[PDB]
């Protein structure tokens, strides 16, 4: 097994305030395949200046997906206090064929800081975190969201400059507010921008450390890191699984400005992923440092036949979901 660094030496966890009503917003960003939203590129052949019909894993036209939002935590003028999160940890979803994720879409626009609805701020991109596995159930106090045996965790870190992917048994810790302790509400991750995101010295383990407060990582078969360049550009992330393992997709490395997703990793996870949840993150800012963080959107994948329009340079800038209606069907034919 892999050394993933020391266990947390903390005797308690940070208290977590779950307030789902603050995260219930209607900010629709439905799939528009005309603009090639949510498209994993059919890698393997050379396509250029051509229109084809292709059956693969796609989200459906007009799917609103599931929206998730991360918020600044409670704070006084000087001191971060309780984390502030939605009820995401108890909402375990079926993995099925996997999913794609629209990330950072609202970046640059003006939006509410969530925990203080009357306060607006410029929206910044934030990366999603996921917990995935083969077996789920409840924690000791009865709350849902516990993943058993080896669990895949995808956790961004370093103020959005890396992604960590690791596959470990998650042993719930027993201090106050921890998942095997008293006064448990939800687990979460956090970082503390004042100390973790100072210029030139980003803390590349902040979120991982926060996670290690709620769970001891045991028998990790791997822990990989992927560096990310800092920007506010819209991006797409995807995840699927085959007998070869778990496949991660991103628009970042191959189509940063266009959004087409290409595979960047295959993780040696051969036990079938059946379940996932979104890991809530809360940003331990002080009141005067509060920002708004871009909602992200998760859309389930399914086998569908699309018309794909490949440009001269090889990218897909237009698609049709053939089964959407008879008109689309006709156009595909
Ligand atoms: C920060 O996280 C990294 C993982 O990204 C930890 O890296 C491990 O560090 C130990 C030494 O402490 C090495 O023996 C392992 O080989 C490292 N693992 C990997 C996957 O790189 C690191 O320990 C963490 N740092 C702190 C201070 O906790
Ligand atoms: C937010 O604004 C930034 C800055 O203008 C945008 O970043 C640019 O994105 C375009 C592609 O859309 C690139 O060609 C530029 O090189 C980027 N500039 C920098 C300085 O990174 C960003 O796209 C905007 N985000 C959203 C969601 O609109």
Residue numbers in the entry: 18 to 350
Paste lines from the article:
To date, little is known about the structural and functional information of NTDs for the MERS-CoV or SARS-CoV S proteins, though its counterparts from other CoVs, such as mouse hepatitis virus (MHV) and bovine coronavirus (BCoV), act as receptor binding domains and their crystal structures have already been delineated. We also solved the crystal structure of the RBD-preceding N terminal domain (NTD, residues 18–353) in the S1 subunit at a resolution of 1.5 Å. Our crystal and cryo-EM structures show that MERS-CoV and SARS-CoV NTDs fold into galectin-like structures as in BCoV, MHV and HKU1CoV. However, the glycan-binding site on the top of MERS-CoV NTD is occupied by a short helix and the N-linked glycan on that helix, and thus NTD in this conformation maybe unable to attach the cell surface by recognizing certain sugar molecules, unlike BCoV and HKU1. By contrast, the NTD domain is observed with strong and clear density, forming a stable triangular platform on the top of the S trimer. The flexible RBD regions are located on the triangular edges between the NTD domains. Since the RBD is located between the NTD domains, a strategy to develop neutralizing antibodies, which target the NTD and interfering with receptor binding through steric hindrance should be feasible in the future.
The key determinant of host specificity is the envelope-located trimeric spike (S) glycoprotein, which can be further cleaved by host proteases into an N-terminal S1 subunit and a membrane-bound C-terminal S2 region. In the S1 subunit, the receptor binding domain (RBD, also called the C terminal domain, CTD) is localized in the C-terminal region, spanning ∼200 amino acids, and structural studies have revealed that the RBD consists of two subdomains: the core and external subdomains. Here we present high-resolution structures of the trimeric MERS-CoV and SARS-CoV S proteins in its pre-fusion conformation by single particle cryo-electron microscopy (cryo-EM).
